[PDB]
Amino acid sequence: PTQAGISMAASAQGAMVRIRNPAVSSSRGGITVLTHSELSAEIGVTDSIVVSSELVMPYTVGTWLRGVAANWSKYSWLSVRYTYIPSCPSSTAGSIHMGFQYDMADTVPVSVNQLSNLRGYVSGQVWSGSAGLCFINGTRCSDTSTAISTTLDVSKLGKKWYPYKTSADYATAVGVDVNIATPLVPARLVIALLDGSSSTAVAAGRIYCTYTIQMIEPTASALNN
Amino acid sequence: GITVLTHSELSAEIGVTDSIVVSSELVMPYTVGTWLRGVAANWSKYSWLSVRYTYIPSCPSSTAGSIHMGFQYDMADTVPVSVNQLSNLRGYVSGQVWSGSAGLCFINGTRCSDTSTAISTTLDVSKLGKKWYPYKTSADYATAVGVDVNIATPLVPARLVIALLDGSSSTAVAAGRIYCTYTIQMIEPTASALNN
Amino acid sequence: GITVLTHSELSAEIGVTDSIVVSSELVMPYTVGTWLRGVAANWSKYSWLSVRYTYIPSCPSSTAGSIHMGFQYDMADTVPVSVNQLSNLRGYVSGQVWSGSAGLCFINGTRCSDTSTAISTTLDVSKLGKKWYPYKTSADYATAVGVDVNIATPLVPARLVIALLDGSSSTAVAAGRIYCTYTIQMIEPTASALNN
Amino acid sequence: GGITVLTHSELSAEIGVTDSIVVSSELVMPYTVGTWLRGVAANWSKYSWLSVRYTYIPSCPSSTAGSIHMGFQYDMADTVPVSVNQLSNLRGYVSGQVWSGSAGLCFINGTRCSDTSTAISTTLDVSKLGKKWYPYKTSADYATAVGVDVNIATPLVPARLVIALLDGSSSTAVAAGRIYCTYTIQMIEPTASALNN
Amino acid sequence: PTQAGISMAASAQGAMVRIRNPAVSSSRGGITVLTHSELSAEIGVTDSIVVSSELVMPYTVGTWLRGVAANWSKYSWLSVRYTYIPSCPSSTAGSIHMGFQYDMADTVPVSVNQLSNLRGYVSGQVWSGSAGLCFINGTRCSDTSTAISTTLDVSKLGKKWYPYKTSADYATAVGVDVNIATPLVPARLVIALLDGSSSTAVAAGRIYCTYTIQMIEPTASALNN
Amino acid sequence: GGITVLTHSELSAEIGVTDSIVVSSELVMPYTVGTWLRGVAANWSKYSWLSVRYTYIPSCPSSTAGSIHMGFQYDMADTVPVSVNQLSNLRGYVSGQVWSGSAGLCFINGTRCSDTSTAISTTLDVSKLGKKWYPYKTSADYATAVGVDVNIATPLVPARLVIALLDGSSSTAVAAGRIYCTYTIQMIEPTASALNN
Ligand SMILES: [Ca+2]
Numbered sequence A, E: 001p002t003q004a005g006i007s008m009a010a011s012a013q014g015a016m017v018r019i020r021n022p023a024v025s026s027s028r029g030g031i032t033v034l035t036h037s038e039l040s041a042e043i044g045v046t047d048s049i050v051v052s053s054e055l056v057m058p059y060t061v062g063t064w065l066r067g068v069a070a071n072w073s074k075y076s077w078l079s080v081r082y083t084y085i086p087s088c089p090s091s092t093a094g095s096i097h098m099g100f101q102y103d104m105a106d107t108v109p110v111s112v113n114q115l116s117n118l119r120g121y122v123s124g125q126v127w128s129g130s131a132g133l134c135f136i137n138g139t140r141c142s143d144t145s146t147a148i149s150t151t152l153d154v155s156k157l158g159k160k161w162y163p164y165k166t167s168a169d170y171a172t173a174v175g176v177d178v179n180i181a182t183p184l185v186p187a188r189l190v191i192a193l194l195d196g197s198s199s200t201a202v203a204a205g206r207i208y209c210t211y212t213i214q215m216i217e218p219t220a221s222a223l224n225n
Numbered sequence B, C: 001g002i003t004v005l006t007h008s009e010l011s012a013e014i015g016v017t018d019s020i021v022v023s024s025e026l027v028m029p030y031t032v033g034t035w036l037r038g039v040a041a042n043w044s045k046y047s048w049l050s051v052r053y054t055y056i057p058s059c060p061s062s063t064a065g066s067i068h069m070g071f072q073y074d075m076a077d078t079v080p081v082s083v084n085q086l087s088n089l090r091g092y093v094s095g096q097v098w099s100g101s102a103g104l105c106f107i108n109g110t111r112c113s114d115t116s117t118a119i120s121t122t123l124d125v126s127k128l129g130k131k132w133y134p135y136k137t138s139a140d141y142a143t144a145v146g147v148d149v150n151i152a153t154p155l156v157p158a159r160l161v162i163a164l165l166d167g168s169s170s171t172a173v174a175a176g177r178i179y180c181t182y183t184i185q186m187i188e189p190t191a192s193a194l195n196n
Numbered sequence D, F: 001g002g003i004t005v006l007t008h009s010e011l012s013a014e015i016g017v018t019d020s021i022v023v024s025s026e027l028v029m030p031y032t033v034g035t036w037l038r039g040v041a042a043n044w045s046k047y048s049w050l051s052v053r054y055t056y057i058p059s060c061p062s063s064t065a066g067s068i069h070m071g072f073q074y075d076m077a078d079t080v081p082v083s084v085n086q087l088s089n090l091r092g093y094v095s096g097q098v099w100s101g102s103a104g105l106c107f108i109n110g111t112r113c114s115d116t117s118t119a120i121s122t123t124l125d126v127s128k129l130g131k132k133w134y135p136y137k138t139s140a141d142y143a144t145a146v147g148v149d150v151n152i153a154t155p156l157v158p159a160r161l162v163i164a165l166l167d168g169s170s171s172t173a174v175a176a177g178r179i180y181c182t183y184t185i186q187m188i189e190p191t192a193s194a195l196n197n
């Protein structure tokens, strides 16, 4: 693109990811702030729709964050962002879909449509979204009108302060009744993948999450459940 | 970036007897009334802004019987059993099954001057558990409470308790109706058929 | 360069029963009342400015039964069938067939302070289909709707739905009356006998 | 006061891409824009469009030959375009390659829009519609009315979106993209859900 | 392209077309000026050469222009431009060819060669020409050295003023003898498509025409033939 | 207006001093803080902590070997500290000789506090609690709920006070001191006494 309205589709997009060292700061008053990025999930697309879901809580979001936040009893999301990066060619067939849900009791979407309604929805070709790189690496952002990434509206969730929960104990409590969950986690991410070309899954891309968290009220790592 | 509406609708039809009859309504969207149920369901959460349960008679000057309403918030708390019990709960209200004729203005918001008579009460949104509650279905709620009641205080805000007595007969009598005049902020949209 | 008047007149006499009785009135000049019918007909068009249907009892303290009114605008919409249905429609209103005694002041516009009790509602001229509707006759209207209902939303603004129940008997009972207090702008004159 | 204002963005129609110019049309009214709104808008008798915007969003390979077209008609009586040519005349004519438009995305999530010149999307000229307020009509009852005479519809629906999907590479369908609608609406004069037609 | 001489071919080109409202102006003296753009024709390419021809007169050029100019007895072309937009991938095989002829009696070209000689000739890959978008949308023009579009040299035709003719009556008159046509239409566009890959036609692109016309001497729409 | 604000100071728990580290815990809620408040708070459905402060006050000889520890946990699901070490991590960890703290006294009678550095006392960080308002829960009903699953408690109680009483000189108990609580509370949504659970 030189003029206006003209667009050139590459044979394939490429984004070189480099995650910078974590950012931690113990701000007097109690809170310890952490802002970091981590590869949150691996993606694959098929000709039939597939709905994947991931809880947006510490233990689940980040693999590093898991071990970190463990030393604090509570936490408050300050900014959670799931960005998508395509690791395939434009010759690949397929689209992605993401959005959030807030009451785990609600059934998980089953149509690209139902999902179009969720909060912070996003769709786009499996081979696009490279634009969002500047988010993950943390550089100066250019044109993001083409990027595939959504953010959690921390502005309005159940509480500001949630308890650090462990996948294990969590599930155990959800086993009793799902509902016990709402006071354990803010919301969850919904991810759909359809419009693919083969019955056997194909390498689509990957989703990195870049968050900023507040951690409070310390505890021995192993005393936390 | 939300969506806010205000409306009024019959929340439940009332009948009086010779003995006390204690009933209760959750103050959540699904259980307030038909309309707000079928709508608010298209949003994952919601926050009460102004809940008002108003009673409005349907009987003759000559139809002995009174009515009582109040609130409760810790669902685990035992449901009242005497008119006295109910007098204690917050935002109480008593009156003859045929009174409250004036509580009408509350539903067609106009020049509401004379509202002393009015048999209606208001939910103190000002301070309930959380501020944003998730939309729940009659079904899924009872299901969860079936385990333990307390899983409810994080699911609903409070519930309106009601009692009718000092009736003319021992068999139900055409009393009146309770309408709810609510204003709500609903958010985080979702396919209607997906909400539980 | 128009012509504007304001008046009030009996729009329909009411009766209550043991079962629900749903009736409806178009909110067009011809169907509001005798007077405004025989006048507004001398003008091709008209625009509502303030429509108010007010109920006024005629029975004794002891005459069980309630009354309900609300509006609808897409004539094609199905006419309500339960008190609940009617509670949903806009500008609802409920009350005992003997109440509304105070809705009187609305017809002899004076010092209307106490109007809570008042069983009356208002048409939101503020926003209906068109702003200038043509004067139509009961006859010619039904004739056109006989083809398809929808030819009506361009002919009338909205219609008032009414229901009466919780009655004392199973055979009509002297209830009250509904009067209409309207203010209208009528234009583009025409021989009375020519309007359809 | 009195009204109620929803502003949302949901899938309005999935698109199949072929070689034989198939031409469709959707009414620009609540019951038709999308499933979600259809569900809500029902609780209100009339409504008025404030800002209606259909936006095409791809979901296919770059190796997918094809172009898509959109436009508006307002006298429901007019004959739906027979040729894409005829279509290129309508108000808000727009057309691009069935795999481009990736940029239009900023209309669906309501983010900060950078350059939207490459976005396959058109809007509704609300200021020039017959009535300000329309009646919520169900596809059913509408058809029944247009059955007697189409003109009885000009007062039930503001406009119609004409969509053409020509140029492809195969004789059968190939999933291409979706057309989401991002509308701002004023819903009024509430009513029981099942009583609306 | 950063340096000079280096060129990058996209997997596929994309041009988002948006036609702006017509431009009409009744300039005292008689003439009514109209400048508008319309999708003039649909394109397809095959392995064997195909020669298409379109008269460059009101009734034929534009589908809207047809109904408009009907209300005037004569017209004078002021600027006629046929632009091409590719709606396919660079992986597609094929080239286009356009030019003008002025004496309908002349036989229609049959070789990409003969056509190379015509006035305002143009050739180019079926999947290119996206550059010309700025013409149709009517934006600021960038590098057009790559665009596939030609213009009618209004400077030198039979008359300046031609009569509005209808396809019907026209053909009827040409049925008598083709020659009667020269005083009925200025010239015509020739379009060839060969160098394709399949025997069965493939979706190539589409040709939009952007013209500026002068219309004069009014008449009841239906009295015009 | 509407609320009701009590601010009081009563014995929250008597302390026995031994040599084998015995570790206890008390919920930081009305029914558990103390007998008096338990009695009042019942007349109100919900409540919100404004300022909670547990203070240890001796009542033994200076020849009484022993140390006491206090701290807070908030995810009721977490395992109550097994070692005093684990405890020294919690928010508001504090610990001193079971005969000192004489100075903390100025927290109970509400007098003018001179130097309180030697006082064995910690406070509750109210600004960082899950909910602002909690439901008054009876130990009974609470246990019954945590019986099904502990997590069902995180929304019933703000935090838990972990107390450790290690280091002593005898194998049996020796009266050491008391932990009084000095709280300021907002009681709301009144209710019949016996109807609260
Ligand atoms: Ca924990």
Ligand SMILES: [Ca+2]
Binding pocket: A103, A105, A106, B044, B134, B135, B136, B195, B196
């Ligand atoms: Ca829900």
Ligand SMILES: [Ca+2]
Binding pocket: C044, C134, C135, C136, C195, C196
């Ligand atoms: Ca007339």
Ligand SMILES: [Ca+2]
Binding pocket: C074, C076, C077, D045, D135, D136, D137, D138, D196, D197
């Ligand atoms: Ca309707």
Ligand SMILES: [Ca+2]
Binding pocket: E073, E163, E164, E165, E224, E225
């Ligand atoms: Ca002619």
Ligand SMILES: [Ca+2]
Binding pocket: B074, B076, B077, F045, F135, F136, F137, F138, F196, F197
């Ligand atoms: Ca309680």
